[PDB]
Write a protein that binds this DNA or RNA. Structure first.
Lengths: 1340, 105, 210
DNA sequence: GGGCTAATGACGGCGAATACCC
DNA sequence: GGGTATTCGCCGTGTACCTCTCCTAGCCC
RNA sequence: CGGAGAGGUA
């Protein structure tokens, strides 16, 4: 039980207890990076594996080797919060023990010298925060996990190759973790063609020729031998009964001396069975059948050894006679069949234009590299490097495992490089798949797709940096001295650090974290992007990969994916899914021993899942672990089916493990269409945090898990009693049993207050505790944004009526009461960040100051003498925030400028204005000013002030620590000084720090006084040096790009209120645009007279297939009724026990419901706290597929003394008359999306224009005109809209002369046009002429 | 439909007014995903196709009232399969006759 | 590479060929609008029709120079509101959906000034726009010369486009809400208040129901 | 400091250049 | 012989908006 | 207002 849970119990209608609790929902990121960065005792994923693969380094000559020993992660110079507020990366320095060893020169192996460069600095790697994000440029970025084809053997099907012959072909692709791909594809002629990477096709056996294989060896390896014995007449053949399953009877198949199968017949299973039961060894066959076969190897004479028969050529009567007369008895011919093993390799050899290693290598080198006259040694080196060097072709452990699994080997490991045996195995099983013995592998199967989390990508790009630095060191070791020189001298920080920074900052999977909700965070970190390097591309289409899979179940959310043109590629991980040890997605399943479904779990991988049969979380469990239904719904390969309760092998751990966190939050998900619920889950992530967070009346129960597991929640690191509560700080007096040895005193939690998260949205943490409240580790000390009492608070509960009020709510449009605006709810704080960079130019360094050339004093009135606006000033667009100035290169005045300055009295300055002005169209209050000044730049007043506030905060924290430590020390010294003679009086009469000036009789007490005095002095120096270190951290210069002196970031807070037009949507996919704010009286009212806050279109339900919102309404109306009924009980100040049975009955309502009972809480205080938190409705937890039934909602309505049918007859407050039937009224949870009409509106008439063209574009002070594309040009062309095109393309868009003339005409008081010559066509004309292609005008 | 477009053996035995089983909702998700991906893909393809069609026929404008051509096209009520699928009236409606039609007999 | 374009040569009409005197906003429903009318935000009308406001202010003597007109429009006083009423009273504007699949995807309306921050679209016309008030966002384009206004009113006004140009038959049609209201009206029962009595015309029919 | 200064997990279509049985 | 029948490149990729980064650097003078 | 990459929207 949790203390924060006691303050507000959320009623759950779940009927099966959660067997497996929801794990940490950001476990993927933390696990990946901890596997990356931790020490390794053996070669495994992480920096150790990369170093062991790249090191040791051997020079060209001199036997000078650079050997790795160990690495440690240097302690980061800054912590996460100060990294963010300083705008610098949060990175851990990497240092490595290296030894440069120079061996004997020259003699048998033996060292001469060894020099140790310990802890060499080669760069800092960004470090993952406890949340699971990375700070790169002062902002939190997330490395989105990637889904990619796992390295290994993939047998896919090539389709569409008909060529008037149809037939689907086959392809075997070899994927290494690093290196060149291998391709064995088929052709309509059943000839195997090999491609390295996507290079042009070659015959299959050519690599076998490159692999030192003769035609005899190639034929022996793949095809089966058939025996021809030189005996009798027309020769006999050793019959194989299992050799006629596909062959046709072209010869007299005899048994026991008599022909069983005649010529021209189709050999059936009956014939095969008869030949098996006859056990005939050899059969006489006609010599024509012998001639049709192909010999598997060369045959020469026995006397002179002259070749008479050779492999890869067919047999003939002349050849048979020649071998018979030369002397032979055993002829080894090839086996051919058009259904099973066929002459695919034989025809490949026949088509193969090379017959020896050198020519094959030459051709391979040529088709690798066009031109480049080839030598044998170069081709040999290239072929060995691309496939047999452990520095250019590695499969890695997962690649080797999948490679063996695809080829059906018992091994789980092996060499990272390709081998001859592996290639011949790929040949054999690809031939088998052509024969029909094998099966094509799925391409989107989650067992054939793998997760590259942050660790794998980081170590891959880091190994790339290691390869670059190893190239550099190999060059330098041979170029320079072979004698002593420290390894720190030739390892540059630029390559590795540059590669790592490029990965973490500018990759296509290193995304800015979508941070407007804890749900947004937790979905972004759990995202699975099939895009990225090594995976898909957005323009795939893709219909196969976009589609959900049967194994896509329970690993990634099927109803969570963007609606844009990347659906089915960007998934979100399921609630319980996690990455395997190799990178596959595994989902927990409860093991079913015989019938009992035990609580033990197994994380079944995608492949392992298919083998077993999985029962559903539905069909509840009675008694210990037996299903209620004898026939239970299960899934064996992805398809629903009925299976016996004694035939199951696994069952779903929970009913929420098939959806993402975003999808699991939707209540009554089993009552919405998958399309509409998918849309609603998509809009949940776009909800902007409301002004005051408030619990949803109808939730799922994942609200608490999402709030806690997200980093926006101030969670008590150590339990204790809250010593000090503040809007900015939480000081916890830690319990004595959680103390470290010695003393550590208090635990401090500084609160994030009003900070631009990532989306110009405010995130602040709300202290939900009070003084003296006992808290324990793991509870919510402060509620994060969009979180109330530790529960997710994405939107707000609102009163809703479902009826078409006067057509102001027409499609999904939404009617808002004026009371919504009265409550100042669905109101948001938006914090925009504006950065002004004072740079050092070649004309002079820019300065930040209040002195701005030729400006009014009104703008500077809010500017301090430091040049930065006050914190708290209300500012609008166009005013100055940061007073930047730039040294003017020269003072040149146009005579027109002189004329203007003479009239208007303008001044002349040698420095030009470049100050950061507020964007035209935004306003607000300055809430945070961040000053970034690197070392070597003098601090100014504002920087000193912000440093002073930071120093005061740190000093206050360390001073409270000092106070508790010195309080303990003074207590013990006073206790000692009381002993050896009572002296308790004078200590009370003197300051508590003056007890160190009081002597005592020489005893052990005096020695204790002396040692405690030196302890006091040591604590004083400890505080002094901690303060000094913090002062150094806050005072030291921060990292800036070259050339810029200072960076001043200003945060502006806008209080955006909801208004007609904002996109406001519900949980279920219910959408809408705010229609208009009609007065509260115009809104309808019920019998009690309560107006309705929100009116939704009832017409959106019978089509968009989301009636869960309707249920959300009814279950809302009950819940708020329970909130209202007790609220009246609060107003009468009734006795505590009455509230007690009321709440107990409210929570006890339901059948087979797990919520437990009171009194387990405190009799009075906790009951009162619960009632006070329950006066505004009672939270209801509704598991998505285990939620409340209709009967439960009706019961809760009845307990609320409200219409059990869920409809109360409203009175139309507009005119004041009831309707012919009651309407559906209740409380529904509405989300205010980040699609504000304020941010979406724009228009313009005249403003900015490009410097290459006169099209209107530029910034957001006045954004350019809207893009009237060719589609709308055709739309006008369909009408007789002919002039309108000419104005909207020539005079309103391009013709600058036309623009000026038409503006002058409209201003002059008429609407007339000049035809004009658009500048866009002039640009096209000029650049056509730029290529030596003439354009001219046929002058009229 | 399930992936590859075939119909699942067991249909959605329930509806929105009662609890959808986990497998039932997952199966409906395949149809929803296929529909949404299909809408996106057909949106792209239809944009490109109407682009092509505007390109080919941009120059087509009616410029003469009469041309005096006695050639034309035959209109019949389309009977494809074994039943009429569009009556003669609609296709003939709005057209201009090429020859003076007669009565059947 | 920038001779070649996708789709089409860039700066001629796509991409992108933007145009002045244009805007964009989310759309709300206005069920009080006549079929030839649209509800356009007051701020949007102000900063779209700015040259018209300048000309009218200088013609009426309310301003002496373009700078005075700029000051007057930025102050947003009540004086310029009457000027904007004058310039908007007959002047129509085109509403336009970003995915335009047919000519009815762009249509001219008479802009009716509304307080608020979003454009109001006629409920009957959304079917023509293939626009559903689910967060969809519309654009506005202002004809400037006389020829443009006349041509929009004659051809692209929604009253002139009541018939589909693809197959005949009308495209503007009561869709769901007015449909439900009408169907509710015209239903009949077997027994209710005021049954089996005789009335003269709809007058006392309205009297008796209401 | 600086003035030169240097891949496929796309897919479908299609024209050009050879490729291959009868 | 000739007509497929491949193999070798070229090419096409809805619409429009919002937000966000992130921007020739190596180097021998 | 020179150009890429990402997300979301319709």
């Amino acid at each position: 039980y949790s203390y924060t849970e006691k303050k507000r119990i959320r009623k759950d209608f779940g009927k099966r207890p959660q067997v497996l609790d929801v794990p940490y929902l950001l476990s993927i990121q933390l696990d990946s990076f901890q596997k990356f960065i931790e020490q390794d005792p053996e070669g495994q994923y992480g920096l150790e594996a990369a170093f062991r693969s790249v090191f040791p380094i051997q020079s060209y000559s001199g036997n000078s080797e650079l050997q790795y020993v160990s690495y440690r992660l240097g302690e980061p110079v800054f912590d996460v919060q100060e990294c963010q507020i300083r705008g610098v990366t949060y990175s851990a320095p990497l240092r490595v023990k290296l030894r440069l060893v120079i061996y004997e020169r020259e003699a048998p192996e033996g060292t001469v010298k060894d020099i140790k460069e310990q802890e060499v600095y080669m760069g800092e790697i960004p470090l993952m925060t406890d949340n699971g994000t990375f700070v790169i440029n002062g902002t939190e970025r997330v490395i989105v996990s990637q889904l990619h084809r796992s390295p290994g053997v993939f047998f896919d099907s090539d389709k569409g190759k008909t060529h008037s012959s149809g037939k689907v072909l086959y392809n075997a692709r070899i994927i290494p973790y690093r290196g060149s791909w291998l391709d064995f594809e088929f052709d309509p002629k059943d000839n195997l063609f090999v491609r390295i990477d996507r290079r042009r096709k070659l015959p299959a056996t050519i690599i076998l020729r490159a692999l030192n294989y003769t035609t005899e060896q190639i034929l022996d390896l793949f095809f089966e031998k058939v025996i021809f014995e030189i005996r009798d007449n027309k020769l006999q053949m050793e019959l194989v009964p299992e050799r006629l399953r596909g062959e046709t009877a072209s010869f007299d198949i005899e048994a026991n001396g008599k022909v069983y199968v005649e010529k021209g017949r189709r050999i059936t299973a009956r014939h095969i069975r008869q030949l098996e039961k006859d056990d005939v060894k050899l059969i006489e066959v006609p010599v024509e059948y012998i001639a049709g076969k192909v010999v598997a190897k060369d045959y020469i004479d026995e006397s002179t050894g002259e070749l008479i028969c050779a492999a890869n050529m067919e047999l003939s009567l002349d050849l048979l006679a020649k071998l018979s007369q030369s002397g032979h008895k055993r002829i080894e011919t090839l086996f051919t069949n058009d259904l099973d093993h066929g002459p695919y390799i034989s025809e490949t050899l026949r088509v193969d234009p090379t017959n020896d290693r050198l020519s094959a290598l030459v051709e391979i080198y040529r088709m690798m590299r066009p031109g480049e006259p080839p030598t044998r040694e170069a081709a040999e080196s290239l072929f060995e490097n691309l496939f047999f060097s452990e520095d250019r072709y590695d499969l890695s452990a997962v690649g080797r495992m999948k490679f063996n699994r695809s080829l059906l080997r018992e091994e789980i490991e092996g060499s990272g490089i390709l081998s001859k045996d592996d290639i011949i195995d790929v040949m054999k099983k690809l031939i088998d798949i052509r024969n029909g013995k094998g099966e094509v592998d799925d391409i989107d199967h989650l067992g054939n797709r793998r997760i590259r989390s942050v660790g794998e990508m980081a170590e891959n790009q880091f190994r790339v940096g290691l390869v670059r630095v190893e190239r550099a060191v190999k060059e330098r070791l041979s170029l320079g001295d072979l004698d002593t020189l420290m390894p720190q001298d030739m390892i540059n920080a630029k390559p590795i650090s540059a590669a790592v920074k490029e990965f973490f900052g500018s990759s296509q999977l290193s995304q800015f974290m979508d941070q407007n909700n804890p749900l947004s965070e937790i979905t972004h970190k759990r995202r699975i992007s099939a895009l990225g390097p090594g995976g898909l591309t957005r323009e795939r289409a893709g219909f196969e990969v976009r589609d959900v899979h049967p194994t896509h179940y329970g690993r990634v959310c099927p109803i969570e994916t963007p609606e844009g043109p990347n659906i089915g590629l960007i998934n979100s991980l399921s609630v319980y899914a996690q990455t395997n040890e190799y990178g596959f997605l595994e989902t927990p399943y409860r093991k079913v021993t015989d019938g009992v479904v035990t609580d033990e779990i197994h994380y079944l991988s995608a492949i392992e899942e298919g083998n077993y049969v999985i029962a559903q979380a539905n069909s509840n469990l009675d008694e210990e672990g037996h299903f209620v239904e004898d026939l239970v719904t299960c899934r064996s390969k992805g398809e629903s089916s009925l299976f016996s309760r004694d035939q199951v092998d696994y069952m779903d751990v929970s009913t929420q493990q098939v959806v993402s966190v975003g999808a699991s939050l939707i209540p009554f998900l089993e009552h919405d269409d998958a399309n509409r619920a998918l849309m609603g889950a998509n809009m949940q992530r776009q909800a902007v945090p409301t002004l005051r967070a408030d619990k949803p009346l109808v939730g799922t129960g994942m609200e608490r898990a999402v709030a806690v597991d997200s980093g926006v929640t101030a969670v008590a690191k150590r339990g204790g009693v809250v010593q000090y509560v503040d809007a900015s700080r939480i000081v916890i007096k830690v319990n004595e049993d959680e103390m470290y040895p010695g003393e550590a005193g208090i635990d401090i939690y500084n609160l994030t207050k009003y900070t631009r998260s990532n989306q110009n949205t405010c995130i602040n943490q709300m202290p939900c505790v009070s003084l003296g409240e006992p808290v324990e580790r793991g509870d919510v000390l402060a509620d994060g944004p969009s979180t109330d009492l530790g529960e997710l608070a994405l939107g707000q509960n609102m009163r809703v009526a479902f009826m078409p009020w006067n057509g102001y709510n027409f499609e999904d449009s939404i009617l808002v009461s004026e009371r919504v605006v009265q409550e100042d709810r669905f109101t948001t704080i938006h914090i925009q960040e504006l950065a002004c960079v004072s740079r050092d130019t070649k004309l002079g360094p820019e300065e930040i100051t209040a002195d701005i050339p030729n400006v009014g004093e009104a703008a500077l009135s809010k500017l301090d003498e430091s040049g930065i606006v006050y914190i708290g000033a209300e500012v609008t667009g166009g005013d100055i925030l940061v007073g930047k100035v730039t040294p003017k290169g020269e003072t040149q005045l146009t005579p027109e400028e002189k004329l203007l300055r003479a009239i208007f009295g303008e001044k002349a300055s040698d420095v030009k204005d470049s100050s950061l002005r507020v964007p035209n169209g935004v306003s607000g209050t300055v809430i945070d000013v961040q000053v970034f000044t690197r070392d070597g730049v003098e601090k100014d007043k504002r920087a000193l002030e912000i440093e002073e506030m930071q120093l005061k905060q740190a000093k206050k924290d360390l001073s409270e620590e000092l106070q508790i430590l010195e309080a303990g020390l003074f207590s013990r010294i006073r206790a000692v000084l009381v002993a050896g003679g009572v002296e308790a009086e004078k200590l009370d009469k003197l300051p508590r720090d003056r007890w160190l000036e009081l002597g005592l009789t020489d005893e052990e007490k005096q020695n204790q006084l002396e040692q405690l005095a030196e302890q006091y002095d040591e604590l004083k120096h400890e505080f002094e040096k901690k303060l000094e270190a913090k002062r150094r951290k806050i005072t030291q210069g921060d990292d800036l790009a070259p050339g810029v002196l200072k960076i001043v970031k200003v945060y502006l807070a806008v209080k955006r209120r909801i208004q007609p037009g904002d996109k406001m949507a519900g949980r279920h996919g219910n959408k809408g645009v705010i229609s208009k704010i009609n007065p509260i009286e115009d809104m309808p009212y019920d019998e009690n007279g309560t107006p309705v806050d929100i009116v939704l279109n009832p017409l959106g339900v019978p089509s968009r297939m989301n009636i869960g919102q309707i249920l959300e309404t009814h279950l809302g109306m009950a819940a708020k009724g329970i909130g209202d009924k007790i609220n009246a009980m609060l107003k009468q100040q009734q006795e505590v026990a009455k509230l007690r049975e009321f709440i107990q009955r409210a929570y006890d309502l339901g059948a087979d419901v797990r919520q437990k009972v009171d009194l387990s809480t405190f009799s009075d205080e906790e009951v009162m706290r619960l009632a006070e938190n329950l006066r505004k409705g009672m939270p209801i937890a509704t598991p998505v597929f285990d939620g409340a039934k209709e009967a439960e909602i009706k019961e809760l309505l009845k307990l609320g003394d409200l219409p059990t049918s869920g409809q109360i007859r409203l009175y139309d407050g507009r005119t004041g008359e009831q309707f012919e039937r009651p309407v559906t009224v209740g409380y529904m949870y509405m989300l205010k999306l980040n699609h504000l009409v304020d941010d979406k509106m724009h228009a313009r008439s005249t403003g900015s224009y490009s410097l290459v063209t006169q099209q209107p574009l530029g910034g957001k002070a006045q954004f350019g005109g809207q893009r009237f594309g060719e589609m709308e040009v055709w739309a006008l062309e369909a009408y007789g809209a002919a002039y309108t095109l000419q104005e909207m393309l020539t005079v309103k868009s391009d013709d600058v002369n036309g623009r000026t003339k038409m503006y002058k005409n409209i201003v002059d008081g008429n609407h007339q046009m000049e035809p004009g010559m658009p500048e866009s066509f002039n640009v096209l004309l000029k650049e056509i002429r730029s290529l030596g292609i003439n354009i001219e005008l046929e002058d009229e | 439909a399930k992936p590859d477009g075939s119909i699942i053996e067991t249909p959605i035995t329930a509806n929105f007014r009662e609890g959808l089983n986990v497998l039932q909702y997952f199966i409906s998700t395949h149809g929803a995903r296929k529909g949404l991906a299909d809408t996106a893909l057909k949106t792209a393809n239809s944009g490109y196709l109407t682009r092509r069609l505007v390109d080919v026929a941009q120059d087509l404008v009616v410029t003469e009232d009469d041309c005096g051509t006695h050639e034309g096209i035959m209109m019949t009520p389309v009977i494809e399969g074994g039943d009429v699928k569009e009556p003669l009236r609609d296709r003939v409606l709005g057209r201009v006759t090429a020859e003076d039609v007669l009565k059947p007999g | 590479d920038m001779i070649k374009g996708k789709q089409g040569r860039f700066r001629q009409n796509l991409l992108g060929k933007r145009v002045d005197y244009s805007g964009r906003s989310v759309i709300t429903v206005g069920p009080y609008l006549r079929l030839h009318q649209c509800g356009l935000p007051k701020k949007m009308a102000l900063e779209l029709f700015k040259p018209f406001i300048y000309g009218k202010l200088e013609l009426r003597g309310l301003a002496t120079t373009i700078k005075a007109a700029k000051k007057m429009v930025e102050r947003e006083e009540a004086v310029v509101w009457d000027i904007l009423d004058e310039v908007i009273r007959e002047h129509p504007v085109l509403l336009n959906r970003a995915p335009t699949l047919h000519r009815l995807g762009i249509q001219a309306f008479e802009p009716v000034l509304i307080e608020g921050k979003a454009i109001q679209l006629h409920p009957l016309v959304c079917a023509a726009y293939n626009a559903d008030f689910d967060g969809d966002q519309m654009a506005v384009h202002v004809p400037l010369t006389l020829e443009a206004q006349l041509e929009a009113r004659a051809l692209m006004m929604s009253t002139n486009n009541i018939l589909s140009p693809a197959n005949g038959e009308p495209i503007i049609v009561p869709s769901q809400d007015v449909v439900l209201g009408l169907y509710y009206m015209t239903r009949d029962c077997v027994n209710a208040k005021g049954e089996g009595m005789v009335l003269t015309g709809p007058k006392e029919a309205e009297r008796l129901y209401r």
